[PDB]
């Protein structure tokens, strides 16, 4: 009744198609327990969102570098950023660690007990900072969005998870062909468009001995 990851395959019993992007691909039987199922859903959502954010930032920086603006490569960007950054190394990572620890244990204890942070303990807000779904919060994180409508929310969930998986593939592609070519992903794309019949993953010397 659903398009699976392989046509004619047997979908898992714990994957009933009620999740976003539920293509029934799970050969290692992970997320079988419902608590770990929720934990895997949360982990996939946050890894997906960070993959899309990092891929978008990498693409924007590489496009700006290709257009002539002074921008670093997606690799060693922070290495040449810190020497001009007023914030030194050490303090920056620790500040982001403290702040992200605050946000992430807040959302962690929201995951453990849904609606636990909607009691007004954090600056007296009740409707906000309360989880609407498994890996989907509400209140502050939906300023104008159409999550009120159920069908549009489901379509946006499917779009978000598919874009997330595409961004994971994009990030592994980024690191792989950066180690292959030592060039920007936009430079690799322009090389592929310029000479598709010869420039590829096979004629780079490395990865094809």
């Amino acid at each position: 009744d659903r398009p699976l990851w392989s046509p004619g395959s047997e979908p898992p019993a714990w994957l009933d198609g009620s999740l976003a992007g539920d293509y029934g691909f799970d050969p290692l039987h992970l997320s079988e327990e419902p608590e770990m199922r929720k934990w895997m859903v949360q982990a996939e959502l946050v890894h997906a969102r960070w993959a899309m954010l990092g891929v978008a930032g990498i693409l924007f920086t590489s496009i700006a570098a290709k257009t002539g603006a002074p921008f670093p490569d997606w690799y060693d960007a922070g290495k040449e950023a810190i020497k001009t950054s007023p914030a030194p190394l050490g303090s920056l990572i620790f500040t982001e660690l403290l702040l992200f620890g605050w946000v992430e244990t807040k959302r962690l204890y929201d995951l453990r007990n849904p609606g636990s942070q909607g009691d007004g303990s954090f600056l007296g807000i009740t409707d906000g900072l309360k989880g609407k779904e498994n890996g989907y919060p509400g209140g502050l994180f939906d300023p104008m969005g159409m999550s009120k409508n159920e069908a549009s929310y489901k379509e946006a969930k499917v779009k978000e998870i598919k874009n997330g998986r595409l961004a994971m593939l994009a990030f592994v592609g980024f690191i792989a062909q950066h180690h292959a070519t030592h060039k920007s992903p936009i430079d690799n794309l322009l090389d592929h468009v310029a000479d598709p019949f010869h420039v590829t993953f096979a004629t780079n010397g490395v990865s094809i001995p």
């Binding site: 096979a202 004629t203 094809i208």
Partner: protein, 230 residues
């Protein structure tokens, strides 16, 4: 007529005019229904998978035996230019033997294209072998109607696999089955030959045919085993 040279007894007792082959040549014995008895998919030694792999090996041998000798006589003639007309093992399949430099892409690029396309093809084939007709239910670019298949996963048919769709009668279909399996069993020995001839002479098979034709005694097994490169 019937049977063959090997033709072990207690092997013709489970095959008599049923399979498209069934010439009685099972000296070792691998189509016994007692083999791989029980439940589940199990192993590869079973009559269904053996017939499936035999016809797949057969058709692949037909395609290979056509493609190995096809550029050669046409290169002797003026059909294809002699620059492209090279021996089948010098096209890039064995780079120690030789590659064709004047291709539109790298041989590994063509290898990746072949890997993607035939991985799609063979994985759909395997998934339909596990679940008959299950590739006509999952949406695939709007062409699900030609992947319905038949009761035999080896012989799917349909709007595309049999687009000529002749042989509707059982007798003509059985004759076509016997013709396919017999030409495939010929292409078996054709590939076995072509490989052995390539390793014993270093030249192409039609050149070996010309050598046997011009001088049968001077160019045969005994002189070529004692010659250079083998």
């Amino acid at each position: 007529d019937f049977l063959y040279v090997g033709s072990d007894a207690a092997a013709l007792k489970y095959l008599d005019g049923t399979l498209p082959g069934d010439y009685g040549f099972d000296p070792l014995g691998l189509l016994d229904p007692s083999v791989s008895g029980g439940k589940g998919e199990g192993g590869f030694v079973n009559p269904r998978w053996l017939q499936y792999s035999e016809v797949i090996h057969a058709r692949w041998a037909m395609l290979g035996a056509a493609g190995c000798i096809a550029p050669e006589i046409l290169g002797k003639a003026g059909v294809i230019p002699a620059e492209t007309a090279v021996d089948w093992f010098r096209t890039g399949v064995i780079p120690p033997a030789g590659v064709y430099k004047n291709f539109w892409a790298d041989p590994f690029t063509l290898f990746f294209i072949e890997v993607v396309a035939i991985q799609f093809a063979e994985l759909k084939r395997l998934q339909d072998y596990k679940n008959p007709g299950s590739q006509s239910r999952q949406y695939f670019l709007g062409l699900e109607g030609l992947f319905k298949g038949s009761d035999n996963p080896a012989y799917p048919g349909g709007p595309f696999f049999n687009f000529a769709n002749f042989g509707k009668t059982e007798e003509e279909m059985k004759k076509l089955k016997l013709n396919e399996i017999k030409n495939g069993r010929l292409a078996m020995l054709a590939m076995f030959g072509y490989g052995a001839q390539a390793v014993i002479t270093g030249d192409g098979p039609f050149d070996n045919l010309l050598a046997h034709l011009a001088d049968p005694t001077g160019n045969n097994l005994i002189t070529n085993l004692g010659g250079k490169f083998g």
